[PDB]
Design an enzyme around this catalytic site. Structure first.
Site, PDB file in Angstrom:
ATOM      1  N   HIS A 154      -3.322  -4.612   1.862  1.00  9.38           N
ATOM      2  CA  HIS A 154      -3.379  -5.951   2.437  1.00  9.38           C
ATOM      3  C   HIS A 154      -2.241  -6.172   3.427  1.00  9.38           C
ATOM      4  O   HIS A 154      -2.216  -7.168   4.145  1.00  9.38           O
ATOM      5  CB  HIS A 154      -3.365  -7.036   1.346  1.00  9.38           C
ATOM      6  CG  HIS A 154      -2.033  -7.238   0.692  1.00  9.38           C
ATOM      7  ND1 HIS A 154      -1.742  -6.760  -0.572  1.00  9.38           N
ATOM      8  CD2 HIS A 154      -0.927  -7.898   1.107  1.00  9.38           C
ATOM      9  CE1 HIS A 154      -0.515  -7.118  -0.901  1.00  9.38           C
ATOM     10  NE2 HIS A 154       0.002  -7.808   0.099  1.00  9.38           N
ATOM     11  N   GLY A 163       6.399 -10.772   0.397  1.00  6.51           N
ATOM     12  CA  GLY A 163       7.338  -9.874   1.042  1.00  6.51           C
ATOM     13  C   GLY A 163       7.522  -8.637   0.176  1.00  6.51           C
ATOM     14  O   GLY A 163       7.808  -7.550   0.683  1.00  6.51           O
ATOM     15  N   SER A 197       5.165  -7.296  -1.501  1.00  2.53           N
ATOM     16  CA  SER A 197       3.907  -6.544  -1.419  1.00  2.53           C
ATOM     17  C   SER A 197       4.089  -5.114  -0.937  1.00  2.53           C
ATOM     18  O   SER A 197       4.840  -4.863   0.008  1.00  2.53           O
ATOM     19  CB  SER A 197       2.925  -7.231  -0.470  1.00  2.53           C
ATOM     20  OG  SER A 197       2.592  -8.531  -0.913  1.00  2.53           O
ATOM     21  N   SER A 243       0.564  -5.198  -5.572  1.00  2.00           N
ATOM     22  CA  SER A 243      -0.630  -5.758  -4.952  1.00  2.00           C
ATOM     23  C   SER A 243      -0.616  -7.286  -4.867  1.00  2.00           C
ATOM     24  O   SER A 243      -0.987  -7.868  -3.845  1.00  2.00           O
ATOM     25  CB  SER A 243      -1.876  -5.305  -5.718  1.00  2.00           C
ATOM     26  OG  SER A 243      -3.043  -5.940  -5.209  1.00  2.00           O
TER      27      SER A 243
END
Length: 188
Positions: A35, A141, A143, A158
């Site tokens: 993502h 951030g 992620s 995730s």
């Protein structure tokens, strides 16, 4: 730029490095969350530059960024606030109940427990399956950041609920499925 787990990188926003790895052609890069960037998305980390070579999100939440310039791989993961680094010696799967720690560029290094695998979660962009739930907190951030148990890489951040001030739950994309499916070699 040294590719170290948990460090920040930008691509029209900010995410964190998962684990340094090389692709089938022996090219340096790192796994992270899908993502964080669509295929072809450009990345900047220090004086380093890269591009999302592989990316799948939703469904899964995995990606591999290939370095195009100044990517120096390491087998390290930053422990930020706790100081120093954790070393990566492999990716043997840790059992449910095992302690696990997360490294992210926003909140730093937090630890918790691996609670369950094969989890499906709903994000604003859609559903992601096969994730692993943990009791670790995370914030925007973080992620793509590293989830590691001891010296064994487990996965990449995730998403989740809550925050690191009051606590929360964080899910991660398992690392082995990425290494296997995309023929990647973890830097150890």
């Amino acid at each position: 730029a040294d590719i170290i787990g948990g460090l920040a990188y930008t691509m029209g926003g900010r995410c964190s490095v998962g684990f340094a790895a090389t692709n089938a052609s022996g090219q340096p890069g790192f796994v992270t969350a899908g993502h964080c960037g669509s295929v072809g998305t450009q990345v900047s980390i220090g004086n380093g530059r890269g591009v999302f070579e592989r990316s799948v999100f939703p469904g899964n939440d995995a990606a591999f960024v290939r370095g195009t310039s100044n990517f120096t791989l390491t087998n390290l993961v930053s422990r930020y606030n706790s100081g120093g680094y954790a070393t990566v010696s492999g990716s043997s799967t840790a059992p449910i109940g095992s302690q696990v720690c997360r490294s992210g560029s926003t909140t730093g290094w937090y630890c918790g427990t691996i609670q369950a695998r094969n989890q499906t979660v709903s994000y604003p962009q859609g559903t992601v399956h096969s994730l692993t739930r943990t009791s670790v907190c995370a914030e925007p951030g973080d992620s793509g950041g590293s989830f590691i148990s001891g010296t064994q890489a487990q996965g990449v951040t995730s998403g989740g609920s809550g925050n690191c001030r009051t606590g929360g739950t964080t899910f991660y994309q398992e690392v082995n499925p990425m290494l296997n499916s995309w023929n990647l070699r973890l830097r150890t």
